[PDB]
Design a binder for this molecule. Structure first.
Ligand SMILES: COc1ccc2cc([C@H](C)C(=O)O)ccc2c1
Ligand SMILES: COc1ccc2cc([C@H](C)C(=O)O)ccc2c1
Lengths: 379, 115, 379, 115
C-alpha cells in the first residue's frame, strides 16, 4: 500500500503547473486582457529564449559517464517495435500512406518529458527519478527529434519529384537547390528546371519562380534539406554545447564558474513557469477544444495512454527491468503529448488538427490517469 | 529511355542577316503545354523572348524584340522553328529553347554570335 | 582598504542583470526579431503578473516587528527636506509652477530599489543589507507612491476648474463625477455642467460629451479620483495582502504552506529576469537615447547622483547612523532612476521626455558610479 | 456674487395653445457663446431642441420639432425668449434653458404640462 504523504508530494509539484495555466486561459477568454496579435509576443519568447536555455541547464548538469544503460535500452525498444510495425502497414496494405505513418508515431512514443515529466516523477519516486528523466530528454533532443525530421523531408522530397517528373524519374543524377529555398513545400512557387546531358544524365535545378530516382540521389537532396533546417533551429545549439561541456566537466571535475552559472540561471528559472503560461494561451486561440470531431478525439487518447505504455510493459521484461525501474518506465510513457511533435505538424501540414487536440485534451486528463497507474502498480 | 532534345540553326553572321533556329524533341507523352525561347547574355542575365503554347494564337513577347521575330510550332515533327530577321549586333548571347512537359526541359546547343 | 573578493561578489550579482538587458536590446535593433506591436506583449505581462507577484514575495517574508526604526527615519528625512524646499520655490518665485515641482522630486528621492537595488547591496555588505533593502520597498509601495499620486490629481483637479470657472470659482459646494470618467485629463471631452441653487450654492457635475473653491471641496473631489485609481492598480493589491500576512505570521510563528508558497514561487522566479528583459526592450523603442537635448540629459544625472545622496549625508548625522549603516544609506540613494516614476509621467504628460532619458542613461552609468562610492567610503 | 438665472412663461394649457418661455440672466462678463434649450421627459431621457449663439443666423433643431418653434435672443435685456406654437399633448416634460459662459449653467423653473 501507500501513504497519504505520497499523495501530498504529487500535489506539491503539480498544483503550481495548473495555476500557471488557468491564469493564461482565463486572461484571454474571460477578462480579455491580451490582444491575439500580442499573444504571439510571448510565444515568440518561449520558443527562442526560455526553452533553449532551459534544456542547456539539464543537459550540462547530467553525468554522461554514469548513464543507466539498462534503462536506456528499454526506451529505445519502444520506438523501434512501433516504428517497425507501421512501415509494415504502409508498404503491404491497400490504403496505407506515409501521411498516416508519422502521425500514428508521434501520438504513441513521444511524451512531454522536459516541462511536465520531470516535476511529476520527482514527486513520486524520490530524487533518482529526477536524474532518469533527464537521461531521456537528452536522447529526444539528439535522436528522436532528428529521425522524425528526416521523415518530413522524405515526405516532401518524394512529392516534388513524383508530381513533376512522372515519366522519366529513373535517370536523374544530381539535384541542385538554390539557397533561397528553405522548405520545398508548395508554400513557394518552385519553378523546377532540368538540364539535359548526352548519355541520359539529367541534372535538375530547383529554383524560385517570379511572376523513382536512384537511392544514391535521394540521400543527397535530403541531407541538404536537413542541414538547412538544423543550423537555424535553436535547440540544436542547446544540445550540442550541453553534451560537450558534460563530457569535459565530469572527468577533470571542473565545476562551472559562478559568473556563468548565475548568468544562465536568471533566464532558466523563467523557463518552466513561462512554458506553462505559453501553453495556457494556446488552449484559447483555437475556436473549439475538440476540432476534428468526437470520433477522433477519443482516438488520440487511445494511441497515447494504452498502446504507448502497454508496449513498454513487454519491452521491459526483455531488457530486464524489475522492481522500481519497472514502475518508472511505465509511468513515463503515460505522460501527455509533447509540444515539439506539434510544431512539426504545423509547418508541414501533416494533420495539424489531430495533434492540436491531443495536446490540449491530453493536459486535462494527464493527472487522473497517471495517478491510476501509481495505485495499480503499488499492489 | 534516352530522351533527346535537338537544337539547330545558329552560327556566326554579320548584322542585318537572317537565321532559322530550331528545337526538335522526341520521347514524350504530351509535350505541348507552354514552351519558351530566351536569351542568356555574357552579363549573367537572361531575358525571356518568345512563347507559343496550347492556344497557338497568343505569343508573349518582350518590348525591345516586339513584333520582329517569327515563332512557329510544328506539331507533327515535334519541332519549334524560330525565324529571326534584322539581326542587331547585340546577339553574341546563346539563344535556345525551354520546352515544358510539366517540368522545364532545356538544352544548350547554339553559337549565335553577331558582329 | 578592501579585498579583491569584494569586487568579485559585486560582479557575481550584477553581470546577470546586464546579460538579460543586452539580449533584449540586441534582438530588436540588430537582428529584428520582435515586431514592435508584439513588443507590447511582454511589457503587458511584466506590469500585471511578474512584478505584483514579485513584490508580494518580499513583503510577506519581511519581519514587521523588528524593523530598524532608526534607519527608517533617515530615509523619511530625505523625502521631507526635499519636499519642503520645492514648495518654497513654487509659491515664492516668479516662474515656479507645479509642473516642475514633481519632476524635480522624482529625479531626486526615488531610486530603483526592488529590481536592481536588492541584488547589488546584497553583494556588497553581506546579507543584512538584503533585509534593509526590503524595508524601503515596503514604504515606497505604501507611502511614497501614494503621496505622489495625490500630486498628479491635484495637478489635474486644479486645471479643470481654473480653465472653465475663472469668475465664480469661490461659491461651489459639491462636485459630482459620473462613473464613466477614470481620469479628468483632457484626453476625454469632459462636458462640465453646473446646477444653480437659491443662495449662491452651485452644484457642479462633470460628464462625458457626445458629438478658488473651498478646501473642504477640493479634498472631496481628489479622494474620489484617487479611490478610482487605487482599486485598479494591481500593486495596491500586492502590498495590502503582503503586510496583512506578515503581521499574522511573525507573531504566532505560522509558516506559509508549501502548496501556496510553491504556487507563487513559479511566477516570482520569472520576475527579476523578465523585468530586466522588459527594460531592455524599452531602450530601443525610442528613436534616440538623449531625446530632450544634451543640455538637460546631464541635468538628470545632476539631480540624481549628487543632490540625492548628499542630502542623506546630512540627514544621517541628525538621526545618528554611523559605521556600517551610514555606508548603506548613502549608496542606496545613488541607485539609478526607478521605472514607476516614469509610468506616472507618461499618463499625465508631465515631462515624459526627461524621465525617459534618466532611466536609460541612468542604467548605463549606474555601475561605475556606485563603485566609486564603495571605494571612497572604505578609506 | 449671487449670480442669478430667471425662467418664466410656463404653465398648464390644453392642446393647440401657445406659450412664451423665457430665460433671464444677470452677473456675467460675456455670456454669449452657445446657448441651448432642451426637454427632460419623465422617461429619464432628454432631447436637445433649439440653440441660438454668436452667429445668430444658425439654429440647430431636432427632427420632430423642426421648423415650428420660435427662438429669439435679446442681447440688451440678457434674456432669451422661446415662443412655442401648436402644442402637442406630449409636453408634460420640463422645458428649460442651458446658458453657457464657458461652462454650462442651468436652472429648473417651469411647469410645462399639456393635456
Ligand atoms: C511555444 O511553446 C513551446 C515551444 C517549445 C517547447 C519545447 C519544449 C521542449 C523542447 C519539449 O518538451 O520536448 C517544451 C515546451 C515548449 C513550449
Ligand atoms: C514594464 O516594466 C516594468 C513595469 C513596472 C515595474 C515596477 C517595478 C517596481 C514596482 C519598482 O521598481 O519600484 C519594477 C520594474 C518594473 C518594470
Amino acid at each position: 500500500m501507500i501513504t497519504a504523504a505520497d499523495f501530498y508530494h504529487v500535489m506539491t509539484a503539480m498544483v503550481p503547473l495548473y495555476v500557471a495555466m488557468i491564469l493564461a486561459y482565463g486572461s484571454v477568454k474571460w477578462w480579455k486582457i491580451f490582444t491575439p496579435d500580442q499573444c504571439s509576443g510571448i510565444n515568440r519568447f518561449v520558443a527562442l529564449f526560455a526553452v533553449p536555455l532551459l534544456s542547456f541547464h539539464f543537459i550540462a548538469a547530467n553525468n554522461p559517464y554514469a548513464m543507466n544503460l539498462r534503462f536506456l535500452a528499454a526506451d529505445s525498444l519502444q520506438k523501434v517495435i512501433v516504428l517497425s510495425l507501421l512501415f509494415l502497414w504502409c508498404k503491404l496494405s491497400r490504403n496505407g500512406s506515409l501521411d498516416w505513418t508519422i502521425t500514428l508515431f508521434s501520438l504513441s512514443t513521444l511524451p512531454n518529458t522536459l516541462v511536465m515529466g520531470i516535476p511529476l516523477l520527482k514527486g513520486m519516486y524520490g530524487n533518482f527519478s529526477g536524474d532518469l528523466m533527464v537521461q531521456i530528454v537528452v536522447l529526444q533532443c539528439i535522436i528522436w527529434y532528428t529521425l522524425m525530421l528526416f521523415l518530413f523531408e522524405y515526405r516532401g522530397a518524394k512529392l516534388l519529384i513524383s508530381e513533376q517528373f512522372p515519366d522519366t524519374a529513373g535517370s536523374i543524377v544530381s539535384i541542385h537547390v538554390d539557397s533561397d529555398i528553405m522548405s520545398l513545400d508548395g508554400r513557394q512557387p518552385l519553378e523546377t528546371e532540368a538540364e539535359i546531358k548526352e548519355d541520359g544524365k539529367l541534372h535538375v535545378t530547383v529554383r524560385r519562380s517570379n511572376a523513382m530516382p536512384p537511392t544514391s540521389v535521394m540521400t543527397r537532396l535530403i541531407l541538404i534539406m536537413v542541414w538547412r533546417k538544423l543550423i537555424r533551429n535553436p535547440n540544436s545549439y542547446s544540445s550540442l554545447f550541453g553534451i560537450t561541456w558534460s563530457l569535459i566537466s565530469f572527468k577533470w571535475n571542473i565545476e562551472m564558474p559562478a559568473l556563468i552559472a548565475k548568468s544562465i540561471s536568471i533566464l532558466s528559472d523563467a523557463g518552466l513557469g513561462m512554458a506553462m503560461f505559453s501553453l495556457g494561451l494556446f488552449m484559447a486561440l483555437n475556436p473549439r477544444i475538440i476540432a476534428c470531431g468526437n470520433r477522433r478525439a477519443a482516438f488520440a487518447a487511445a494511441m497515447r495512454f494504452v498502446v504507448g505504455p502497454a508496449v513498454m510493459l513487454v519491452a521491459s521484461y526483455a531488457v530486464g527491468l524489475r522492481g522500481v525501474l519497472l514502475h518508472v518506465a511505465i509511468i513515463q510513457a503515460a505522460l501527455p503529448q509533447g509540444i515539439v511533435p506539434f510544431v512539426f505538424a504545423k509547418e508541414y501540414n501533416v494533420h495539424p488538427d489531430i495533434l492540436s487536440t491531443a495536446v490540449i485534451f491530453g493536459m486535462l486528463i494527464a493527472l487522473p490517469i497517471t495517478l491510476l497507474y501509481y495505485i495499480l502498480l503499488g499492489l | 529511355s534516352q530522351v533527346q532534345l535537338v537544337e539547330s540553326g545558329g552560327g556566326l553572321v554579320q548584322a542585318g542577316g537572317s537565321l532559322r533556329l530550331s528545337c526538335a524533341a522526341s520521347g514524350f507523352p504530351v509535350d505541348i503545354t507552354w514552351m519558351e525561347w530566351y536569351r542568356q547574355a555574357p552579363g549573367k542575365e537572361r531575358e525571356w523572348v518568345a512563347a507559343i503554347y496550347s492556344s497557338g494564337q497568343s505569343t508573349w513577347y518582350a518590348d525591345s524584340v516586339k513584333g520582329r521575330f517569327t515563332i512557329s510550332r510544328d506539331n507533327a515533327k515535334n519541332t519549334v522553328y524560330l525565324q529571326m530577321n534584322s539581326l542587331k549586333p547585340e546577339d553574341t548571347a546563346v539563344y535556345y529553347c525551354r520546352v515544358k512537359v510539366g517540368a522545364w526541359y532545356k538544352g544548350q546547343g547554339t553559337q549565335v554570335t553577331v558582329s
